[PDB]
Design an enzyme around this catalytic site. Structure first.
Site, PDB file in Angstrom:
ATOM      1  NE  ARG A   1       5.534   4.151  -0.233  1.00 44.23           N
ATOM      2  CZ  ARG A   1       6.375   4.923   0.460  1.00 44.23           C
ATOM      3  NH1 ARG A   1       6.688   6.157   0.056  1.00 44.23           N
ATOM      4  NH2 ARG A   1       6.910   4.456   1.589  1.00 44.23           N
ATOM      5  N   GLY A   2       0.162   4.714  -2.541  1.00 44.78           N
ATOM      6  CA  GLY A   2      -0.427   5.137  -3.813  1.00 44.78           C
ATOM      7  C   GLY A   2       0.538   5.912  -4.693  1.00 44.78           C
TER       8      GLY A   2
ATOM      9  CG  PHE B   1      -0.821  11.936  -3.507  1.00 44.65           C
ATOM     10  CD1 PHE B   1      -0.976  12.420  -2.204  1.00 44.65           C
ATOM     11  CD2 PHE B   1      -1.959  11.720  -4.277  1.00 44.65           C
ATOM     12  CE1 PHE B   1      -2.237  12.661  -1.677  1.00 44.65           C
ATOM     13  CE2 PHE B   1      -3.226  11.962  -3.755  1.00 44.65           C
ATOM     14  CZ  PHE B   1      -3.363  12.434  -2.455  1.00 44.65           C
ATOM     15  N   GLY B   2       1.525  10.114  -1.448  1.00 45.21           N
ATOM     16  CA  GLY B   2       1.294   9.703  -0.067  1.00 45.21           C
ATOM     17  C   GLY B   2       1.708   8.276   0.245  1.00 45.21           C
TER      18      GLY B   2
ATOM     19  CE  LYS C   1      -3.276   8.359  -1.216  1.00 46.38           C
ATOM     20  NZ  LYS C   1      -3.934   7.805  -2.434  1.00 46.38           N
TER      21      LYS C   1
ATOM     22  CG  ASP D   1      -6.863   3.576 -12.583  1.00 43.10           C
ATOM     23  OD1 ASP D   1      -6.473   3.059 -13.650  1.00 43.10           O
ATOM     24  OD2 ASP D   1      -6.138   3.648 -11.564  1.00 43.10           O
TER      25      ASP D   1
END
Ligand SMILES: CN1CCN(c2cccc3cc(NC(=O)Nc4ccc(Oc5ccnc6[nH]ccc56)cc4)ccc23)CC1
EC number: 2.7.11.25
Length: 292
Positions: free
Chosen positions: A19-20, A22-23, A38, A131
């Protein structure tokens, strides 16, 4: 661009694949195609999802992850599944890790530069990744094709972050070039940048802000060292553009055949001013002197 609205009934959700910020990302199927979805997990997260959806819709490149569509009920993105996982995992992940070659190391870095150069050359306004690091680089086609993505951050990127970014200056698209310089060192050495440092992340920021870079590499071709160390420069204006990196790296691939061979052999590991490269440059020097 062509962004599909999707029916969640037609998606066959299989399993969670990390996962990231969020989500939660899940592997699934959709019209007989493997897809990473996602999905959002709280109604609060929608402002970020819209920016992500508006970004992913603009980008269309072989080295940036493909959005197929998005379901608005429930709110989720639908991307092409990258079977290989992150570059971070191939480099540093759970054993058994795959063997790879200087050709692979260069091809991954080339492909990454091609994708970032696409972002930088976009109009009306140029996109900046800000990033770029191996956790956000996914591999496909047996580890031979690299795809830029962004899992997002909540509030670890310090090792790949340009000094002007983390010091709260005006940054530009030259911060991505810095990151790329560090990734190049990382794939060549198969070392995590700044484990000699360690401790909390502000230690790395401090170190890098005072000029500390990764150590130089024994027997690295002078041209590859020139490129790498220009990208590390404190002064953003002295770093090359991605257009320039792509051109150079494209041309160096002449001396790095075999990048299309899938990752399939295993590897067993040890770790010793300078550092030994993981990959081997004998064949580079061999092929080089045949031309020069
Ligand atoms: C200021 N911005 C900085 C970054 N920007 C971006 C630039 C380029 C690509 C971007 C992709 C995004 N979205 C994205 O890539 N999300 C995402 C990533 C990975 C993921 O998980 C997978 C996807 C495919 N195969 C997978 N296999 C295992 C996980 C996995 C799911 C969603 C979000 C932003 C992006 C432009 C300017």
């Amino acid at each position: 661009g062509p962004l599909h609205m999707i029916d969640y009934k037609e998606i066959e959700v299989e399993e969670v694949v990390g996962r990231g910020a969020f989500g939660v990302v899940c592997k699934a199927k959709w019209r007989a195609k493997d897809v990473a979805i996602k999905q959002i997990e709280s109604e609060s997260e929608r402002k970020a999802f819209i920016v992500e959806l508006r970004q992913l819709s603009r980008v269309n490149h072989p080295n940036i992850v493909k959005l197929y569509g998005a379901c608005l009920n429930p709110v989720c993105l639908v991307m092409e599944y990258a079977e290989g996982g992150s570059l971070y995992n191939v480099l540093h992940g759970a054993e058994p890790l795959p063997y790879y070659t200087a050709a692979h190391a260069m091809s991954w870095c080339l492909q990454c530069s091609q994708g970032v150069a696409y972002l930088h050359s976009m109009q009306p306004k140029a996109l900046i990744h800000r990033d770029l690091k191996p956790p956000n680089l996914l591999l496909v086609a047996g580890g031979t094709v690299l795809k830029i993505c962004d899992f997002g951050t909540a509030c670890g990127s310090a090792a790949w972050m340009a000094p002007e970014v983390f010091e709260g200056s005006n940054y530009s698209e030259k911060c991505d070039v810095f990151s790329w310089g560090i990734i190049l060192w990382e794939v060549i050495t198969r070392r995590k940048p700044f484990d000699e440092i360690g401790g909390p992340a502000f230690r790395i920021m401090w170190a890098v802000h005072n000029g500390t870079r990764p150590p130089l590499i024994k027997n690295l071709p002078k041209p590859i060292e020139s490129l790498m160390t220009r990208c590390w420069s404190k002064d953003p204006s002295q770093r090359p553009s991605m257009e320039e990196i792509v051109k150079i790296m494209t041309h160096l691939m002449r001396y790095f055949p075999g990048a299309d061979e899938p990752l399939q052999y295993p590897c067993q590991h040890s770790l010793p001013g300078r550092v030994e490269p993981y990959v081997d440059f004998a064949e580079f020097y061999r092929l080089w002197s045949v031309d020069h």
